Amino acid sequence: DYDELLKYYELHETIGTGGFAKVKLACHILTGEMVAIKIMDKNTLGSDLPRIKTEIEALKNLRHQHICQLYHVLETANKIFMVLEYCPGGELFDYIISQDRLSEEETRVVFRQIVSAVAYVHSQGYAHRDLKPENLLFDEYHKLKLIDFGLCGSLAYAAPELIQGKSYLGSEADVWSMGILLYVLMCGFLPFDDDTAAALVAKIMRGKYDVPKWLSPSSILLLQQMLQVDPKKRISMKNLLNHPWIMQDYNYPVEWQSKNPFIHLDDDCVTELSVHHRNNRQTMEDLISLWQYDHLTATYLLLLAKKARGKPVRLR
Ligand SMILES: CCOc1cc(OCC#Cc2ccc3ccncc3c2)ccc1C[NH3+]
């Protein structure tokens, strides 16, 4: 149901096309800021409900320049709504196709942002496990924002040990997937590719792939370190962060650390919320610090975003 949602947001166009979920552009009424709202249906999710809720819980604990920001989770009889940072530049998927394949130096810029995000995810004790271009969006500055739940699918990005249901480390699976992404960025097609699941899986397990003539020797060496069938022989995140290839154009390791972590509440945002809700400062801070990802969380985070853009920290 939409009744509560529409008390806080005005719906604009559909932007995201899907199968179990729609995405809408919307305005957050109190702040006037634009958001994307992902609409998921509970019955259509079925027994993925728990797994989806677990991942939503994980997202509540991430805060990073290359990870899409969550503002609000609203649950009803049949729906879960996720109110998220609007990323107007569209999927990395469509960008790759539009350009055929990226230059080595553009792929380096973009790939460093992926590594930044994924390294941070790992540092917080999580692993993504479904990295692929459909799960990466560009903002209006053409910076990458990692998402999830995006639509043989992700089989082509899946690590061999993952594919065969055996024991694995999420971090190692993520490195394999980033290797597939690296290939695609530079080639415009997949390293392992086929008409059926059995054929595709067979190829993945063997680990052989073509090396186009335009790939540099250093690109070739990095690809082989990331696409090692045996997870133990795969490059670690530690060694990826300062890899020679990674630092070839910009001679500094990947800045993976969060650039705007939540430390203390922002006083200007608290002040404005206090005047608005007719609360004193202590009472308002106490409410905000519950971090329920309700409408109050959303309002706080969106005022914080306003301030970051130099706009008056003001509610309408
Ligand atoms: C590390 C990221 O973790 C997660 C990200 C999630 O993102 C859900 C989403 C989205 C989305 C879809 C379409 C958009 C269109 C335009 N602008 C923004 C959009 C955002 C969900 C869960 C996790 C946790 N693994």
Side-chain angles (χ1 to χ4, degrees):
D1 185 83
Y2 279 72
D3 203 65
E4 180 176 356
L5 190 66
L6 299 166
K7 288 187 153 195
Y8 305 127
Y9 304 91
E10 279 185 34
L11 272 24
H12 293 48
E13 329 92 58
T14 297
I15 62 209
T17 172
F20 65 79
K22 320 155 203 281
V23 175
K24 270 155 196 309
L25 186 63
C27 189
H28 177 261
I29 291 157
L30 259 194
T31 61
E33 296 287 310
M34 301 305 116
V35 295
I37 306 184
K38 180 172 191 74
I39 302 160
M40 300 176 85
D41 191 278
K42 282 187 202 170
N43 304 81
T44 316
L45 290 164
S47 68
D48 242 59
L49 180 272
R51 182 213 130 211
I52 294 292
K53 279 188 149 184
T54 291
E55 291 296 340
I56 285 171
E57 220 54 29
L59 182 58
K60 292 172 170 176
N61 300 302
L62 303 173
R63 162 66 165 199
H64 194 269
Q65 61 273 16
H66 294 301
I67 301 178
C68 190
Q69 179 61 231
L70 182 71
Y71 301 120
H72 193 167
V73 181
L74 179 50
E75 178 177 321
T76 68
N78 303 48
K79 308 284 177 183
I80 297 170
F81 302 94
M82 296 184 71
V83 183
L84 286 317
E85 177 182 7
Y86 175 43
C87 300
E91 289 168 25
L92 178 57
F93 177 85
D94 296 286
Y95 183 64
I96 288 161
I97 293 165
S98 69
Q99 312 292 128
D100 180 15
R101 73 197 183 238
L102 311 193
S103 68
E104 189 169 349
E105 34 281 276
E106 190 171 359
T107 124
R108 225 173 253 119
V109 164
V110 154
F111 196 72
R112 283 175 64 109
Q113 303 173 43
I114 297 167
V115 173
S116 176
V118 175
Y120 172 81
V121 171
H122 297 176
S123 79
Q124 298 320 113
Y126 301 104
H128 191 284
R129 291 177 192 92
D130 201 19
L131 298 171
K132 62 196 170 153
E134 296 95 328
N135 279 148
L136 285 154
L137 274 31
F138 283 111
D139 71 3
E140 66 272 30
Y141 296 95
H142 212 68
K143 304 293 183 73
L144 279 186
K145 302 278 176 166
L146 185 56
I147 53 159
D148 196 359
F149 307 158
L151 305 174
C152 300
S154 31
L155 185 52
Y157 292 85
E161 71 275 17
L162 191 305
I163 292 307
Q164 56 183 308
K166 84 175 324 187
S167 71
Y168 73 97
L169 284 180
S171 61
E172 289 173 340
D174 280 348
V175 171
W176 171 277
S177 302
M178 289 188 285
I180 303 296
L181 271 164
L182 177 56
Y183 191 91
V184 175
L185 285 165
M186 294 193 295
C187 295
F189 50 73
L190 296 156
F192 317 103
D193 200 38
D194 229 311
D195 300 317
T196 59
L200 209 207
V201 169
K203 286 176 159 190
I204 286 169
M205 302 309 213
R206 200 188 318 99
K208 307 289 121 117
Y209 52 86
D210 301 325
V211 177
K213 194 157 190 158
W214 62 79
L215 271 53
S216 66
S218 72
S219 287
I220 290 165
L221 266 15
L222 181 51
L223 281 169
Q224 77 188 50
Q225 288 179 281
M226 305 187 79
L227 296 180
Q228 287 290 138
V229 165
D230 179 353
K232 164 177 89 258
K233 297 184 188 197
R234 224 112 91 204
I235 195 169
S236 66
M237 189 61 47
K238 182 177 152 69
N239 292 134
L240 191 59
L241 288 170
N242 65 171
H243 195 271
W245 184 93
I246 280 276
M247 299 177 59
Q248 197 171 125
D249 297 330
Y250 183 70
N251 193 215
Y252 298 95
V254 172
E255 305 159 29
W256 61 269
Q257 288 157 67
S258 172
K259 281 173 200 312
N260 287 298
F262 301 125
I263 292 169
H264 293 328
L265 265 15
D266 183 273
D267 289 347
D268 297 329
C269 296
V270 172
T271 297
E272 181 66 8
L273 254 12
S274 295
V275 308
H276 178 86
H277 286 108
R278 317 184 88 177
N279 286 314
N280 54 260
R281 185 181 301 280
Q282 192 52 240
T283 294
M284 192 75 250
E285 285 189 355
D286 283 350
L287 257 357
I288 296 163
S289 299
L290 262 9
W291 289 98
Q292 293 186 42
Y293 289 80
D294 59 355
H295 183 63
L296 170 61
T297 301
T299 304
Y300 174 79
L301 286 175
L302 290 169
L303 281 177
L304 201 57
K306 274 191 155 199
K307 215 250 263 244
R309 284 181 330 257
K311 295 205 286 211
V313 179
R314 292 285 147 98
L315 265 5
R316 89 102 136 126

mmCIF file of all heavy atoms in Angstrom, residues 28-31 269-280 284 295-296 299 303 314-316:
data_model
loop_
_atom_site.group_PDB
_atom_site.id
_atom_site.type_symbol
_atom_site.label_atom_id
_atom_site.label_comp_id
_atom_site.label_asym_id
_atom_site.label_seq_id
_atom_site.Cartn_x
_atom_site.Cartn_y
_atom_site.Cartn_z
ATOM 1 N N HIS A 28 11.205 14.146 -1.949
ATOM 2 C CA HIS A 28 11.002 14.103 -0.496
ATOM 3 C C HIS A 28 10.406 15.434 -0.067
ATOM 4 O O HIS A 28 11.088 16.449 -0.078
ATOM 5 C CB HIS A 28 12.323 13.852 0.218
ATOM 6 C CG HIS A 28 12.226 13.861 1.710
ATOM 7 N ND1 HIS A 28 12.566 14.949 2.459
ATOM 8 C CD2 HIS A 28 11.831 12.910 2.589
ATOM 9 C CE1 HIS A 28 12.385 14.679 3.736
ATOM 10 N NE2 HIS A 28 11.941 13.444 3.836
ATOM 11 N N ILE A 29 9.135 15.417 0.301
ATOM 12 C CA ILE A 29 8.369 16.655 0.493
ATOM 13 C C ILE A 29 9.002 17.676 1.437
ATOM 14 O O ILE A 29 9.073 18.847 1.100
ATOM 15 C CB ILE A 29 6.896 16.362 0.893
ATOM 16 C CG1 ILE A 29 6.162 15.739 -0.293
ATOM 17 C CG2 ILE A 29 6.158 17.633 1.283
ATOM 18 C CD1 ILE A 29 4.950 14.921 0.081
ATOM 19 N N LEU A 30 9.453 17.241 2.607
ATOM 20 C CA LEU A 30 9.915 18.172 3.634
ATOM 21 C C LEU A 30 11.186 18.934 3.255
ATOM 22 O O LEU A 30 11.324 20.104 3.586
ATOM 23 C CB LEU A 30 10.146 17.453 4.968
ATOM 24 C CG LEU A 30 9.111 17.552 6.073
ATOM 25 C CD1 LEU A 30 9.756 17.058 7.369
ATOM 26 C CD2 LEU A 30 8.554 18.964 6.239
ATOM 27 N N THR A 31 12.103 18.267 2.566
ATOM 28 C CA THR A 31 13.383 18.873 2.144
ATOM 29 C C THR A 31 13.399 19.340 0.681
ATOM 30 O O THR A 31 14.251 20.141 0.305
ATOM 31 C CB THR A 31 14.556 17.892 2.266
ATOM 32 O OG1 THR A 31 14.326 16.765 1.415
ATOM 33 C CG2 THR A 31 14.764 17.433 3.740
ATOM 34 N N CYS A 269 21.770 20.322 11.175
ATOM 35 C CA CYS A 269 20.641 19.418 10.860
ATOM 36 C C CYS A 269 19.737 19.149 12.078
ATOM 37 O O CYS A 269 18.503 19.160 11.955
ATOM 38 C CB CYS A 269 21.153 18.098 10.273
ATOM 39 S SG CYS A 269 22.003 18.305 8.662
ATOM 40 N N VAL A 270 20.354 18.912 13.236
ATOM 41 C CA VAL A 270 19.614 18.697 14.499
ATOM 42 C C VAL A 270 18.825 19.966 14.859
ATOM 43 O O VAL A 270 17.651 19.901 15.206
ATOM 44 C CB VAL A 270 20.539 18.255 15.654
ATOM 45 C CG1 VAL A 270 19.796 18.227 16.988
ATOM 46 C CG2 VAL A 270 21.101 16.882 15.365
ATOM 47 N N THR A 271 19.475 21.113 14.769
ATOM 48 C CA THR A 271 18.813 22.360 15.060
ATOM 49 C C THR A 271 17.530 22.467 14.214
ATOM 50 O O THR A 271 16.443 22.689 14.746
ATOM 51 C CB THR A 271 19.735 23.562 14.801
ATOM 52 O OG1 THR A 271 20.860 23.505 15.673
ATOM 53 C CG2 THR A 271 19.010 24.889 15.010
ATOM 54 N N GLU A 272 17.658 22.307 12.900
ATOM 55 C CA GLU A 272 16.529 22.511 12.030
ATOM 56 C C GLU A 272 15.411 21.520 12.329
ATOM 57 O O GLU A 272 14.236 21.883 12.324
ATOM 58 C CB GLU A 272 16.958 22.428 10.573
ATOM 59 C CG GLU A 272 15.840 22.662 9.579
ATOM 60 C CD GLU A 272 15.242 24.065 9.583
ATOM 61 O OE1 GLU A 272 15.751 24.978 10.259
ATOM 62 O OE2 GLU A 272 14.230 24.238 8.878
ATOM 63 N N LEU A 273 15.781 20.276 12.588
ATOM 64 C CA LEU A 273 14.806 19.243 12.944
ATOM 65 C C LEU A 273 14.089 19.565 14.273
ATOM 66 O O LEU A 273 12.887 19.293 14.429
ATOM 67 C CB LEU A 273 15.492 17.871 13.009
ATOM 68 C CG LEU A 273 15.333 16.766 11.940
ATOM 69 C CD1 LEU A 273 14.684 17.201 10.657
ATOM 70 C CD2 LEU A 273 16.663 16.060 11.686
ATOM 71 N N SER A 274 14.836 20.137 15.213
ATOM 72 C CA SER A 274 14.290 20.532 16.527
ATOM 73 C C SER A 274 13.236 21.626 16.353
ATOM 74 O O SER A 274 12.163 21.525 16.945
ATOM 75 C CB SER A 274 15.402 21.015 17.472
ATOM 76 O OG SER A 274 16.308 19.977 17.785
ATOM 77 N N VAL A 275 13.541 22.655 15.548
ATOM 78 C CA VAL A 275 12.598 23.752 15.351
ATOM 79 C C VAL A 275 11.363 23.176 14.695
ATOM 80 O O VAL A 275 10.251 23.477 15.089
ATOM 81 C CB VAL A 275 13.119 24.961 14.503
ATOM 82 C CG1 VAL A 275 14.452 25.494 15.011
ATOM 83 C CG2 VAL A 275 13.209 24.637 13.021
ATOM 84 N N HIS A 276 11.561 22.340 13.691
ATOM 85 C CA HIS A 276 10.450 21.795 12.959
ATOM 86 C C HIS A 276 9.544 20.900 13.796
ATOM 87 O O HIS A 276 8.332 21.052 13.761
ATOM 88 C CB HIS A 276 10.937 21.037 11.731
ATOM 89 C CG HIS A 276 9.833 20.411 10.956
ATOM 90 N ND1 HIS A 276 9.135 21.095 10.005
ATOM 91 C CD2 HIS A 276 9.298 19.166 10.993
ATOM 92 C CE1 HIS A 276 8.216 20.308 9.478
ATOM 93 N NE2 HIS A 276 8.297 19.131 10.065
ATOM 94 N N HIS A 277 10.123 19.967 14.539
ATOM 95 C CA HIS A 277 9.342 18.998 15.309
ATOM 96 C C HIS A 277 8.924 19.514 16.688
ATOM 97 O O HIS A 277 8.311 18.785 17.476
ATOM 98 C CB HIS A 277 10.104 17.682 15.429
ATOM 99 C CG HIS A 277 10.111 16.892 14.156
ATOM 100 N ND1 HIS A 277 11.241 16.745 13.376
ATOM 101 C CD2 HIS A 277 9.125 16.206 13.525
ATOM 102 C CE1 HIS A 277 10.952 16.002 12.322
ATOM 103 N NE2 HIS A 277 9.676 15.664 12.388
ATOM 104 N N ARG A 278 9.258 20.770 16.969
ATOM 105 C CA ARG A 278 8.932 21.407 18.238
ATOM 106 C C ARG A 278 9.472 20.551 19.387
ATOM 107 O O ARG A 278 8.778 20.310 20.374
ATOM 108 C CB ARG A 278 7.412 21.675 18.322
ATOM 109 C CG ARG A 278 6.875 22.232 16.995
ATOM 110 C CD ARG A 278 5.406 22.621 16.979
ATOM 111 N NE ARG A 278 5.173 24.004 17.411
ATOM 112 C CZ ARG A 278 3.980 24.590 17.435
ATOM 113 N NH1 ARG A 278 2.906 23.911 17.052
ATOM 114 N NH2 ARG A 278 3.847 25.854 17.843
ATOM 115 N N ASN A 279 10.723 20.102 19.227
ATOM 116 C CA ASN A 279 11.484 19.396 20.270
ATOM 117 C C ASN A 279 12.699 20.218 20.700
ATOM 118 O O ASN A 279 13.195 21.036 19.942
ATOM 119 C CB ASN A 279 12.005 18.033 19.771
ATOM 120 C CG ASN A 279 10.913 16.969 19.652
ATOM 121 O OD1 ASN A 279 10.098 16.796 20.549
ATOM 122 N ND2 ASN A 279 10.902 16.250 18.527
ATOM 123 N N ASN A 280 13.175 19.994 21.925
ATOM 124 C CA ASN A 280 14.502 20.475 22.341
ATOM 125 C C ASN A 280 15.602 19.613 21.708
ATOM 126 O O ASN A 280 15.294 18.576 21.119
ATOM 127 C CB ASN A 280 14.638 20.503 23.861
ATOM 128 C CG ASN A 280 14.301 19.175 24.511
ATOM 129 O OD1 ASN A 280 13.197 18.985 25.028
ATOM 130 N ND2 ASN A 280 15.241 18.256 24.493
ATOM 131 N N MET A 284 15.587 15.537 20.452
ATOM 132 C CA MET A 284 15.727 15.311 19.016
ATOM 133 C C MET A 284 16.928 14.421 18.669
ATOM 134 O O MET A 284 16.817 13.529 17.841
ATOM 135 C CB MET A 284 15.849 16.645 18.294
ATOM 136 C CG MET A 284 15.713 16.549 16.780
ATOM 137 S SD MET A 284 13.988 16.298 16.308
ATOM 138 C CE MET A 284 14.079 14.617 15.733
ATOM 139 N N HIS A 295 11.031 7.922 8.496
ATOM 140 C CA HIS A 295 10.986 9.244 7.879
ATOM 141 C C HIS A 295 11.930 10.231 8.549
ATOM 142 O O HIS A 295 12.476 11.105 7.882
ATOM 143 C CB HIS A 295 9.558 9.799 7.924
ATOM 144 C CG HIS A 295 9.404 11.130 7.250
ATOM 145 N ND1 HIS A 295 9.623 11.309 5.899
ATOM 146 C CD2 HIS A 295 9.054 12.343 7.736
ATOM 147 C CE1 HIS A 295 9.415 12.575 5.585
ATOM 148 N NE2 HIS A 295 9.067 13.223 6.681
ATOM 149 N N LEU A 296 12.128 10.105 9.866
ATOM 150 C CA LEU A 296 13.094 10.972 10.575
ATOM 151 C C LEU A 296 14.535 10.731 10.105
ATOM 152 O O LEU A 296 15.250 11.675 9.811
ATOM 153 C CB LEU A 296 13.011 10.814 12.094
ATOM 154 C CG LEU A 296 14.118 11.485 12.905
ATOM 155 C CD1 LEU A 296 14.136 12.988 12.684
ATOM 156 C CD2 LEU A 296 13.949 11.148 14.375
ATOM 157 N N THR A 299 14.857 12.307 6.650
ATOM 158 C CA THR A 299 14.919 13.755 6.727
ATOM 159 C C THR A 299 16.275 14.258 7.191
ATOM 160 O O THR A 299 16.790 15.248 6.666
ATOM 161 C CB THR A 299 13.822 14.321 7.629
ATOM 162 O OG1 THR A 299 12.558 13.870 7.147
ATOM 163 C CG2 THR A 299 13.865 15.836 7.600
ATOM 164 N N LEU A 303 18.881 16.425 4.846
ATOM 165 C CA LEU A 303 19.369 17.725 5.284
ATOM 166 C C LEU A 303 20.896 17.748 5.283
ATOM 167 O O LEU A 303 21.521 18.746 4.932
ATOM 168 C CB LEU A 303 18.860 18.061 6.692
ATOM 169 C CG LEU A 303 17.436 18.578 6.875
ATOM 170 C CD1 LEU A 303 17.137 18.766 8.364
ATOM 171 C CD2 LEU A 303 17.191 19.880 6.121
ATOM 172 N N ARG A 314 17.358 23.703 5.624
ATOM 173 C CA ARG A 314 16.017 24.186 5.848
ATOM 174 C C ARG A 314 14.967 23.191 5.352
ATOM 175 O O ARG A 314 15.105 22.579 4.299
ATOM 176 C CB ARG A 314 15.817 25.510 5.109
ATOM 177 C CG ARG A 314 16.612 26.683 5.647
ATOM 178 C CD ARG A 314 16.017 27.200 6.943
ATOM 179 N NE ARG A 314 17.048 27.708 7.844
ATOM 180 C CZ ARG A 314 17.382 28.993 7.985
ATOM 181 N NH1 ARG A 314 16.775 29.951 7.284
ATOM 182 N NH2 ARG A 314 18.341 29.332 8.843
ATOM 183 N N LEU A 315 13.912 23.055 6.151
ATOM 184 C CA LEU A 315 12.749 22.237 5.816
ATOM 185 C C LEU A 315 11.636 23.136 5.353
ATOM 186 O O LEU A 315 11.493 24.254 5.842
ATOM 187 C CB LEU A 315 12.259 21.487 7.051
ATOM 188 C CG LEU A 315 12.696 20.065 7.349
ATOM 189 C CD1 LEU A 315 13.735 19.503 6.400
ATOM 190 C CD2 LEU A 315 13.144 20.019 8.789
ATOM 191 N N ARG A 316 10.837 22.658 4.412
ATOM 192 C CA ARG A 316 9.826 23.506 3.791
ATOM 193 C C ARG A 316 8.592 23.832 4.669
ATOM 194 O O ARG A 316 8.486 23.409 5.832
ATOM 195 C CB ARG A 316 9.405 22.890 2.462
ATOM 196 C CG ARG A 316 8.262 21.887 2.501
ATOM 197 C CD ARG A 316 6.984 22.538 2.025
ATOM 198 N NE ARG A 316 6.223 21.693 1.105
ATOM 199 C CZ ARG A 316 4.945 21.352 1.266
ATOM 200 N NH1 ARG A 316 4.249 21.779 2.324
ATOM 201 N NH2 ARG A 316 4.350 20.574 0.361
#
